[PDB]
């Protein structure tokens, strides 16, 4: 029944996966122990020891430190897949 290898997926918190509503963007609270790049600014998003609360988009598939939202940075842009 299993004859299709994935591409290294990631199953975040299933208990309570909320969604950060924003300008055409619905980010999701999750962590990334692997090298993840933020969509907002141009900095690395990840951590081997203590992974910061990263927000992944449940549409175009992106990531942005929860910090950006908590700080409200204009750098963040609207989702692209939600229009094209
Ligand atoms: Zn950033
Ligand atoms: Zn998006």
Swiss-Prot record:
<feature type="zinc finger region" description="Phorbol-ester/DAG-type">
    <location>
        <begin position="24"/>
        <end position="79"/>
    </location>
</feature>
<protein>
    <recommendedName>
        <fullName>Rho-associated protein kinase 2</fullName>
    </recommendedName>
</protein>
<comment type="function">
    <text>Protein kinase which is a key regulator of actin cytoskeleton and cell polarity. Involved in regulation of smooth muscle contraction, actin cytoskeleton organization, stress fiber and focal adhesion formation, neurite retraction, cell adhesion and motility via phosphorylation of ADD1, BRCA2, CNN1, EZR, DPYSL2, EP300, MSN, MYL9/MLC2, NPM1, RDX, PPP1R12A and VIM. Phosphorylates SORL1 and IRF4. Acts as a negative regulator of VEGF-induced angiogenic endothelial cell activation. Positively regulates the activation of p42/MAPK1-p44/MAPK3 and of p90RSK/RPS6KA1 during myogenic differentiation.</text>
</comment>
<comment type="similarity">
    <text>Belongs to the protein kinase superfamily. AGC Ser/Thr protein kinase family.</text>
</comment>
<comment type="subunit">
    <text>Homodimer. Interacts with IRS1. Interacts with RAF1. Interacts with RHOA (activated by GTP), RHOB, RHOC. Interacts with PPP1R12A. Interacts with EP300. Interacts with CHORDC1. Interacts with BRCA2. Interacts with NPM1; this interaction enhances its activity. Interacts with SORL1. Interacts with PJVK.</text>
</comment>
